[PDB]
């Protein structure tokens, strides 16, 4: 409701909370009532005679604009403007429609360590196949090539001149000196050029196990015109079989210059690679995100878990299982492209702390996410409109700003511009000045006095002393003192004092209320600022908390097991904690630990359940309260008891939820006399 403290204007009233409204109708406030009685909640004001057409109630609203001349739009709407009131969320829908046939530019990086010899043999006979696979998805496609080994300095590479001449372990055949990054083939749609350029490559070697492919990726992403990128889908296949160096490894080689993230290509070679450190993963992710390049990690079996962690840092990336001879690569690109395209993320650029933004997802598979920090759901299908709900909440009366909501991996953007709604559309151009004694104007139903004149109707002058007659309205009752001793009576209304003690905000009609006199949780009034606020004896909390001191969360309580039942039916949830009855233990009232063995009696049901014995005592119905049977063995109290006839019957008695409700499994083999 409307926790208002001190309010004296329509804007001041609305700024005190999202539920406060302002009844403007004249002849509403009695002579003995103050102007703060207007700032109440809507139903209360409508109850006391105010109408629906004379309350102000500024309300946050959103209106969208779309480009009619723009065809084949993939993310709509384009521009949205908001009129935000603090404490009230504006919401609008953003629709994503997957388009068809977007060309592919695939760049290939391969390690040339000595273990990659067979892969090099297979890959250099593969350009036409990969181009054909690209064309089976879109009408136009181009392919490229690259290479990397490691930095040419110890301890990463042996710097002995003989070993720099031939770093391969075997001296028999051809092997090229180590290098950091070489750009081999420009992005082209010709297969013969791919065959000829790659066919000239020779294998290399180094000393360490990890390889410096992050330098190669940063150089690929930082030199757009040399690579040949066009404004289409950009892919980057990373084919390795080991780990990767990252920032900090260069100190072993006495290299402590951080990577600048700028192009350092001369004669298609990454010279100056021995004076810069490896990039950090954050730098690589930021560069790839800003250039819309989507990595595809084609790694061996033992490295899949290692490279899978990168996907939490780098969205729009995929990990594939690469064979030891690299024969399953093209199928890997197909699957990686399917996985990349099937998932959609919705995110916004950086915005200040005064604005909160939340996303809700609805899509084809039926999975719906609510109150998420970013939008995400899989199964995005072609020509299926998938909608996201964006909720924007302002915490203060903000100024004009703008932030962009974007679909990650695409150039299309949604621009959002925000306005405040901290203004009241009051009627003042035709108000009667006579009601203000001519010394003011009726704004929103209240009068504002000119210079010198004071009072609710401007009936007093500040230079004159307050009359003793008006002092009678400044006390609550015959025993209450004027303004409760914490204020001054001037022109018939109390004017409260201030206090040097922090948090001492004196308010109220008679200055009776105070801000620090409420229920205290852990020495803090209302559990501290993070749970609720004090309003002169009553504590009202922020959403998500309840109770006399806001110590109890409202929902999403811990009283529920994964099967979504409160305390397994063995207690009552009271302030996020189950109050178990009988001898059942916290937190979910599951186990009965000191509990007498129940297997003594439940043989009476077990005899008839799986041995076809009929009614003795009674039929096994309206008896056996809450006992059911399980076909498969159920983990629980293993038992063995004497049959009612003489044999040995052993059953395992699992416990389900409820009161005296179990699940039984009776064995069929019996030891008999």
């Amino acid at each position: 409701e409307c926790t208002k403290f001190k309010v004296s204007s329509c804007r001041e009233c609305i700024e005190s909370g999202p539920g406060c409204t302002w009844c403007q109708k004249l002849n509403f406030t009695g002579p003995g009532d103050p102007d703060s009685i207007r700032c109440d909640t809507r139903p209360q004001l409508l109850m006391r005679g105010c109408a629906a057409d004379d309350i102000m109630d500024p309300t946050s609203l959103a209106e969208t604009q779309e480009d009619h001349n723009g065809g084949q739009k993939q993310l709509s709407p384009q521009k949205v403007t908001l009129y935000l009131r603090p404490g009230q969320a504006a919401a609008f829908n953003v629709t994503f429609r997957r388009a068809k046939g977007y060309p592919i530019d695939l760049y290939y990086l391969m390690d040339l360590s000595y273990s990659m010899l067979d892969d090099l043999r297979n890959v250099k006979k593969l350009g036409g196949d990969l181009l054909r696979a690209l064309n089976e998805i879109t009408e136009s496609g181009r392919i490229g090539f690259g290479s990397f080994v490691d930095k040419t300095v110890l301890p990463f590479v042996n710097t002995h001149p003989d070993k720099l001449r031939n770093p391969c372990p075997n001296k028999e055949k051809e092997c090229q000196p180590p290098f950091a990054f070489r750009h081999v083939l420009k992005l082209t749609n010709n297969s013969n050029q791919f065959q000829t350029e790659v066919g000239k490559q020779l294998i290399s070697g180094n000393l360490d196990a990890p390889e410096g492919g992050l330098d190669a990726m940063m150089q690929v992403a930082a030199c757009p015109e040399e690579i040949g990128w066009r404004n289409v889908t950009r892919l980057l296949v990373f084919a390795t079989d080991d780990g990767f160096h990252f920032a900090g490894d260069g100190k072993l080689g006495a290299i402590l210059t951080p990577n600048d993230g700028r192009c350092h290509l001369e004669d298609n070679l990454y010279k100056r690679s021995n004076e810069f450190d490896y990039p950090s993963v954050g730098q690589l992710a930021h560069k790839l995100a800003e250039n819309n390049i989507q990595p595809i990690f084609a790694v061996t079996s033992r490295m899949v878990k290692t490279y899978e962690k990168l996907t939490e840092i780098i969205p729009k990336s995929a990990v594939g299982e690469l064979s030891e001879d690299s024969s399953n690569v093209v199928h890997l690109i197909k699957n990686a492209y399917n996985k990349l395209s099937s998932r959609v993320f919705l995110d916004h650029n950086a915005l200040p702390d005064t604005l909160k933004v939340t996303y809700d997802s609805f899509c084809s598979n039926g999975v719906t996410h609510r109150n998420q920090p970013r939008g995400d759901c899989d199964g995005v299908q072609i020509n299926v409109p998938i909608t996201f709900q964006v909720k924007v909440t302002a915490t203060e009366c903000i100024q004009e700003q703008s932030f962009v909501i974007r679909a990650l991996g695409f150039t299309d953007i949604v621009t959002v511009q925000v306005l405040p709604q901290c203004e009241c559309r009051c009627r003042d151009q035709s108000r009667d000045r006579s009601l203000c004694h001519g010394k003011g104007f009726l704004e929103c139903g209240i009068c504002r006095c000119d210079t010198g004149y004071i009072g609710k109707n401007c009936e007093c002058q500040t230079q004159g002393r307050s009359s003793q007659e008006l002092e009678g309205s400044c006390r609550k009752d015959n025993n209450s003192i004027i303004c409760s001793g914490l204020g001054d009576c001037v022109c018939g209304q109390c004017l409260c004092h201030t206090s040097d003690v922090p948090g001492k905000l004196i308010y109220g009609q008679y200055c009776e209320c105070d801000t620090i006199n409420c229920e205290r949780y852990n020495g803090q009034v209302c559990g501290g600022p993070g749970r609720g606020l004090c309003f002169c004896g009553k504590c009202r909390c922020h959403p998500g908390f309840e109770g006399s001191a806001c110590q109890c969360e409202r929902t999403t309580e811990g009283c529920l097991n994964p099967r979504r039942v409160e305390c397994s039916g063995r207690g009552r949830c009271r302030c996020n904690v189950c109050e178990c009855h009988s001898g059942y233990q916290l937190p979910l009232c599951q186990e009965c630990p000191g509990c007498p063995s129940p297997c003594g009696k439940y043989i009476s049901c077990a005899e008839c359940l799986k041995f076809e014995k009929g009614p003795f005592g009674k039929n096994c119905s309206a008896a056996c309260p809450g006992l059911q049977l399980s076909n498969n063995p159920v983990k629980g109290r293993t038992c063995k008891e004497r049959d009612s006839e003489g044999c040995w019957v052993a059953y395992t008695l699992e416990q389900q939820d409820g009161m005296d409700r179990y699940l039984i499994y009776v064995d069929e083999s019996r030891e008999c006399v």
Partner: protein, 856 residues
Amino acid sequence: FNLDTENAMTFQENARGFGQSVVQLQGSRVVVGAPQEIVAANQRGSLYQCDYSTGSCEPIRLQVPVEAVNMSLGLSLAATTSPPQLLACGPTVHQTCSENTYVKGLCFLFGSNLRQQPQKFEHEMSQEGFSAAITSNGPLLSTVGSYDWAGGVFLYTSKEKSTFINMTRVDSDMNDAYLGYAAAIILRNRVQSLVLGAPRYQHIGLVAMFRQNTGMWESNANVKGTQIGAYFGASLCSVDVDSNGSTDLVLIGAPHYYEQTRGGQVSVCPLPRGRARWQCDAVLYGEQGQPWGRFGAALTVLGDVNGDKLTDVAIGAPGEEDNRGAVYLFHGTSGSGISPSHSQRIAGSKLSPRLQYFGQSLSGGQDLTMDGLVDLTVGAQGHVLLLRSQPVLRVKAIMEFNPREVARNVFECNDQVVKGKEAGEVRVCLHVQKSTRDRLREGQIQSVVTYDLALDSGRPHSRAVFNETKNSTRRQTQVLGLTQTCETLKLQLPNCIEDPVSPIVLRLNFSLVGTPLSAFGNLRPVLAEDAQRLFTALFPFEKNCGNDNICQDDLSITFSFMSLDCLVVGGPREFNVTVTVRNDGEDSYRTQVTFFFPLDLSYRKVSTWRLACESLKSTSCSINHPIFPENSEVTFNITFDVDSKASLGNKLLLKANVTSENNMPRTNKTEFQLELPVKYAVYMVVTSHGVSTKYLNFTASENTSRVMQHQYQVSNLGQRSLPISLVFLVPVRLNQTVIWDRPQVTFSENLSSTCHTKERLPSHSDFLAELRKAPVVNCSIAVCQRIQCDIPFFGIQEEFNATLKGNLSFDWYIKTSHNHLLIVSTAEILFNDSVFTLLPGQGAFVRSQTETKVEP
């Protein structure tokens, strides 16, 4: 907040790599390494010795062996404060062979004088000395390249004796971990132990702990990182917050942690207790909007800087503001922890535009200015800076009035008197004191202090005005030493006060500026960042409650724990105290009730005219301000919250007394205290267990015996540990025939226990009829041995089995109508009921019985 930034001396040198490594030495000089500077042909690396007295520095002469080509001397440094020692290492020695080239390392140890220095797949690419420390036994050199870059460390006990410390190779998971990239020494009970960091372990990181168990070093704990590529373990720091001689926590930096708005992360890790696991508790962060700032690249101990006897640390962020760099300062807190927010941030851009990578190297814990205050050395690219701590000051102020209260004739309405000629006086005294201890002489520290005086602050019109200014405000500035000064000034009232119920209030608040010290390089003292800056005193009016007497009130306080006998800790979380206050005398002004309770009670609410209450601890409640009238009485309940892990003994006391502004002598009515018993909630269960014998049968024609065991399981499921007693009732004879001979009790947990056996007689003589009703052979119709076993310590959340074993015979069997007899044995747990109690409805599980059926 007390690190100097305007008078920082900068060392500049054109050698390459200058400022990469920095270390303080012997309280007067700082050593700086230049790893990449080319001294001569096939030589790389140089050392410099920079002095604060002169402000310049020259290289330290050192004869490099011819085999140490391109050794990169100065990449790592270490020092010892007492005795003075210096260790310098070059980890990049290019040993060139016929077919290969290897990267080994050398280290040089220096004594007090810098003139003579001793030289210190599998161990080939060792890079020994990459990070190094000095133990009391000798140098400690790490090898990041040992065993396929798994790591390790070499600990030298002599010039030619060393031991290798590393992990255990159960698998290849530790390959390429770079263990020994960072190193530290922990102290406890004057014995040293090692901490080693591996920032590349599984690409996530790892930090290790090593202890010498029976003369051999072994790893006893380790922690791990979370985010890939963050370098968890790339920098280590041991902190002793209380400075008692035992290390409390270890700071671990992850300079390459990635968030959308922050870069860098430092983790606080308290040391494990015994064999407990090592865990992280808090994480420190840099400022917002500084990605790739490399927060946590270098961090060192600064010692106590603010003078609160708690150790403080500094952390470096070389990558901030586009590689300009920054240095953060964190204060230590009680509880072996680090405060989560920084106290100062020094930015390189605010010092000089030429600074780059400011904060890449740090060193602190000594004084180099000879004024007794610790100093911090920060290394940058081509520069080394010296930041100096400053004296910390506090101010205490006191106000007195004379007379203490306004006289009646001053403010009474009168027509034959001169208006505005009232009088008064207020005395104001200020005292400036110093907190930090240092070597500067007395009388050098002077400060300029200005302050405000506000009469009736918070009131539109003040009742009293100063005589000299004729308004409610006054400004004055003056210079203070470390000595109290006093000043007095008259108070005047222009008109009568028609609301004498409110005292006149005086407010004071100040600002302090410290004058520089010319003898110690223009150092300026500063005010404490938490110093109180506002003070208030009250000036009450005289009372005339009746016939111009002194206002004589009579106050009485009583309270009672109504309908409550014992305070059960662990049961109900709150309890009431109904307290009543009476005023038999005339009007009471500013009535105040103060409570006193132990440390495990917290004030929750007050329910009942008006009652405002605020906080062995204490709380103060207000009784109907301003006035509590004549023949008045108030009754109210004060709620308390009792901690579930409270320790109040068996007897808790509450104390309360009443007070008022009239300030009259204390009386027995004014004071009251009452005492309440305490009990502790305990929950523990005893149950029969399945392996206990369920069935036995016999043939009367045969005389074979059998073994019987009744196994009980005892658990302390409660949150308390208490001494307990177990009693087993065992049927032994029936109509003078032995049933269960010489029964014995044995415990599975081999916990301490003592047992004593006693016999009790049956209550029913006619055993035949009793068997005829029910076929139970128990203590009602048989002789029972009562085995009582006493356990002095029954631990929390721990359990054991208690088997009761003995052999049987079947010569006591009665041929009743039923074809069976039951042998029942009961085990029930006792405790001192005067201290411990069971919760309602939970007492049914402290007893159990076990039955064994016998048929022919």
